[PDB]
Amino acid sequence: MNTVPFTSAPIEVTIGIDQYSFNVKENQPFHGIKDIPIGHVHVIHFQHADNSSMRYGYWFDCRMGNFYIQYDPKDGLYKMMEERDGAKFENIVHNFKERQMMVSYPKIDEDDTWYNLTEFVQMDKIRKIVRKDENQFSYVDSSMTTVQENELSDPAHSLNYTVINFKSREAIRPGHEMEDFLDKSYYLNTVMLQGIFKNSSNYFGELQFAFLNAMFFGNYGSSLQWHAMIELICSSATVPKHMLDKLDEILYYQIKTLPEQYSDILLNERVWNICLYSSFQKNSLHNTEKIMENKYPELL
Amino acid sequence: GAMNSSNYAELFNNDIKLFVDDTNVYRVTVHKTFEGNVATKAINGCIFTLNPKTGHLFLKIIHTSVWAGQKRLSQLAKWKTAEEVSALVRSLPKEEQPKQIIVTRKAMLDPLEVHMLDFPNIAIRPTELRLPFSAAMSIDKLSDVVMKATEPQMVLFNIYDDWLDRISSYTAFSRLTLLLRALKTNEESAKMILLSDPTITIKSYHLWPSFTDEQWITIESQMRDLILTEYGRKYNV
Numbered sequence: 001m002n003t004v005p006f007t008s009a010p011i012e013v014t015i016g017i018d019q020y021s022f023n024v025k026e027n028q029p030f031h032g033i034k035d036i037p038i039g040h041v042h043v044i045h046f047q048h049a050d051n052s053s054m055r056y057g058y059w060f061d062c063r064m065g066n067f068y069i070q071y072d073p074k075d076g077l078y079k080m081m082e083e084r085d086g087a088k089f090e091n092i093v094h095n096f097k098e099r100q101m102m103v104s105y106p107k108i109d110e111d112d113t114w115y116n117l118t119e120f121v122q123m124d125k126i127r128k129i130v131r132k133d134e135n136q137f138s139y140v141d142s143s144m145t146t147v148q149e150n151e152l153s154d155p156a157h158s159l160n161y162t163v164i165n166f167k168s169r170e171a172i173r174p175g176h177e178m179e180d181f182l183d184k185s186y187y188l189n190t191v192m193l194q195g196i197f198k199n200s201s202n203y204f205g206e207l208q209f210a211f212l213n214a215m216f217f218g219n220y221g222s223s224l225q226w227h228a229m230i231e232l233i234c235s236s237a238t239v240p241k242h243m244l245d246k247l248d249e250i251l252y253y254q255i256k257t258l259p260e261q262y263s264d265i266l267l268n269e270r271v272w273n274i275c276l277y278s279s280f281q282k283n284s285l286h287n288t289e290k291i292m293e294n295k296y297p298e299l300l
Numbered sequence: 301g302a303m304n305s306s307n308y309a310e311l312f313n314n315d316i317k318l319f320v321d322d323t324n325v326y327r328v329t330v331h332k333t334f335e336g337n338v339a340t341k342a343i344n345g346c347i348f349t350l351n352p353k354t355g356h357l358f359l360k361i362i363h364t365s366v367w368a369g370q371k372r373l374s375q376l377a378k379w380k381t382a383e384e385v386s387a388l389v390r391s392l393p394k395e396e397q398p399k400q401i402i403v404t405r406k407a408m409l410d411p412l413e414v415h416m417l418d419f420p421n422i423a424i425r426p427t428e429l430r431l432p433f434s435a436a437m438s439i440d441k442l443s444d445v446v447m448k449a450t451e452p453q454m455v456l457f458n459i460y461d462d463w464l465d466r467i468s469s470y471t472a473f474s475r476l477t478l479l480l481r482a483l484k485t486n487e488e489s490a491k492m493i494l495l496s497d498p499t500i501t502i503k504s505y506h507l508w509p510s511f512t513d514e515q516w517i518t519i520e521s522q523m524r525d526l527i528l529t530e531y532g533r534k535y536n537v
């Protein structure tokens with residue numbers, strides 16, 4: 001179990017760690033989060049009490065270094081940093097634990113939610129989508145745009161998701177126009193899975209990361225990417241059976257975890273109705289279709 | 301964006317453009333089977349691709365053999381239309397290729413967009429107008445060449461005959477749309493109007509009769525009357 005200490009909490013802020021969150025008051029004695037499960041990526045995220053504009057945060061994996069949070073009063077945000085002095089870090093943590101100034105990552109033992117939401121998400125792939133190679137952790141916020149969004153403006157601050165465009169030469173083989181547009185299997189299996197992602201695990205990883213950025217930061221381009229990757233699978237007549245079964249589990253837990261009051265903006269009616277009721281895979285997503293129908297029947 | 305009443309003069313400027321109408325591509329007769337079920341029999345169709353500035357009509361005849369062994373023909377017809385329009389564009393010299401293609405039905409947008417990916421600078425546009433191009437098969441010489449075809453065939457026609465020697469494109473298109481609207485609303489009456497006077501003939505190289513300017517005004521007035529009339533007979537006004 002690992003720890004992310006905080007130097008201090010000088011401004012009132014709502015702090016999230018994965019799917020949990022808690023309020024910290026201005027200058028409240030708060031020195032971090034302990035008992036973070038090892039083996040998963042994690043995200044620590046922030047919404048200031050005075051400017052609910054800009055949710056922002058950091059993706060990290062405690063196996064890759066010792067990370068802490070420190071508020072920067074010049075740039076006005078909580079920043080993640082790496083502590084390279086291992087003994088200095090252990091000492092800092094042990095003292096803050098002894099003073100009981102840390103919140104405990106509050107995982108119920110029965111609960112697999114975070115595993116299920118991050119099953120295929122790896123830090124190494126996150127760091128290719130979010131390029132800042134001098135850090136082991138990755139910053140994301142509400143306003144960052146995707147490479148594809150920029151095509152339709154600061155490249156260093158972009159989300160380099162894999163561009164998916166259904167009316168593009170990459171998606172449509174010359175002479176198979178109708179075939180490839182109505183059945184996207186060649187774009188899914190040959191172009192994307194075999195060519196770009198190499199395997200379904202990396203495809204699901206990016207799909208899951210896109211959802212999480214949409215949910216935790218309200219990142220609109222991430223929501224677009226999540227829905228595009230769903231629609232590319234559902235619009236393919238030929239998908240490996242294991243991918244369909246896994247997709248159903250992935251989306252089930254995403255829909256289960258989505259705040260009910262955010263569905264209106266985070267769920268695209270056209271994609272979901274097409275995927276669950278019109279597409280080739282309309283009958284292959286039983287768990288996802290059942291939770292959607294019981295939780296968001298208005299959308300459909 | 302979309303083509304409508306407000307931007308109607310754009311049709312007659314100097315940027316090359318084509319209308320594409322797919323109404324008459326997939327044509328069937330519906331009939332009973334010996335067992336008392338219903339079946340369709342396809343008949344020859346055509347793509348109606350028209351330059352509204354010059355009157356140049358590229359009439360691609362769609363022979364019933366293209367449907368043999370195919371499923372979901374109404375969907376296929378849109379993609380076949382888009383394939384043939386794309387092939388036509390590729391066949392034209394660069395300086396004759398259109399800058400825009402306006403489809404008369406919105407369902408042609410995605411099929412044509414996908415077939416034209418190689419031409420990113422050609423705009424594919426819908427229209428809000430209710431254009432009467434389905435009535436093209438009420439033009440006897442066009443109907444005749446479609447029905448007689450025994451194989452796929454492209455046939456070239458100027459749909460304005462020689463009118464542009466005496467009138468502008470705007471006026472020519474207005475005349476064309478009035479004639480076709482009349483033919484669509486009441487084909488028999490419309491055709492009676494056009495041929496009532498045996499002394500006015502259709503030149504071998506034309507589609508419509510050789511009316512004088514004064515006779516066109518009379519004709520155009522009779523076609524307007526017809527279209528309001530049928531609008532009374534239909535709505536009881």
Ligand SMILES: CCCC(=O)NCc1cccs1
Pocket residue numbers: 355356357358456457458
């Ligand atoms: C084909 C009858 C003679 C003529 O008017 N050619 C010009 C055209 C080019 C394309 C359609 S019409």
